[PDB]
Design a protein around this ligand. Structure first.
Ligand SMILES: Cc1nc(-c2ccc(C(F)(F)F)cc2)sc1C(=O)O
Lengths: 188, 188
């Protein structure tokens, strides 16, 4: 791999200060986001190659979800607040897109309860100031990088991953090129 | 429901003569269209609510996806001509938006093959004047209603569905309101 601005990544005209080191955006409605997370395991594969100390951040957005989309963003805030992202990401993606068992906020709550989060705890977090702030943070971060679509990933508020210019003849190779690019950018 | 023009539906300025009773437009590149098919099953649920004998028509549009977009419109003509819409809708949607493995006309052809359509039969259809006419029909129909985006549904060439004005907190409530609006308009 030979890295060039415009090839594996692009450079934001307006860099974001104080941005997370590695910031990924997604939506539980987004088919290619399902592909990224549930099939390719982009987040996990990127994390595996990240330099020690560099943490990953993942935010939910709402391009095609209406009110339910907003519920999902707030629920993702709850997942972050409780630190249970690795417990609810799979049943949320599956429930929305595959089994079609997630149709409302109540169904989202049921997913957390089934994953081991007590209903009272979910509700406390849901109505918490921490989650209210996390919802605002997700929205602001999207605005800051002038987010146009998902999935997307940004490194140090400066660089935007560009998977269009990566090898896709093989999904295993794509994942490695993608993850290697994040590693490279994080080291810049 | 209190139906109001501008809320659940809009009224075309110049209604289309001889227009299909129920006419849907979509694109395989269209994210809400993907949702309308896989998660909400709008067409199925509208059909269920309408009387037996109301014709539903669904056309593909050109203005998403560049050259592959035109190819998909021709491919949808093939599907209509062969009567295999239900065999190819999901793998076309997922090939375009989920796995992104549909990149050329050849990839579209592969989907039809894998869905059981004999290759020689696809090719004969692809190059047929019956299909050429169906492509023209889809384009003319969109032009007749001055189509600006997808998804879109028109009733009796008079009214256009307005999902933006509907409740989006619960998927099944949205589908119910959508289908109920179509029935209301059909009886107007
Ligand atoms: C076509 C469309 N469709 C929308 C939608 C449909 C269903 C739902 C939910 F299922 F979540 F209820 C949300 C948004 S918004 C929308 C638009 O063009 O504004």
């Amino acid at each position: 791999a030979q890295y060039e601005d415009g090839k594996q990544y692009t450079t934001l005209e307006k860099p974001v200060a104080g941005a997370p080191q590695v910031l990924e955006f997604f939506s539980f409605f987004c088919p290619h986001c399902y592909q990224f997370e549930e099939v390719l395991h982009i987040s996990d594969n990127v994390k595996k190659k990240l330099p020690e100390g560099v943490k990953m951040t993942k935010y939910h957005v709402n391009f095609m979800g209406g009110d339910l989309g907003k519920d999902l963003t707030q629920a993702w805030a709850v997942a972050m607040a409780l630190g249970v992202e690795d417990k609810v990401t799979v049943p949320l993606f599956e429930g929305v897109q595959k089994t079609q068992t997630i149709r409302s906020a109540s169904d989202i709550r049921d997913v957390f309860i089934n994953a081991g989060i007590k209903g009272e705890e979910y509700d406390a977090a849901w109505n918490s100031f921490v989650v209210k702030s996390l919802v605002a943070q997700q929205e602001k971060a999207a605005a800051d990088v002038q987010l146009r679509g998902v999935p997307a990933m940004f490194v140090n508020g400066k660089y935007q991953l560009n998977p269009q210019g990566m090898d896709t003849s093989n999904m295993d190779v794509f994942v490695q090129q993608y993850a290697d690019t994040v590693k490279y950018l994080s080291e810049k």
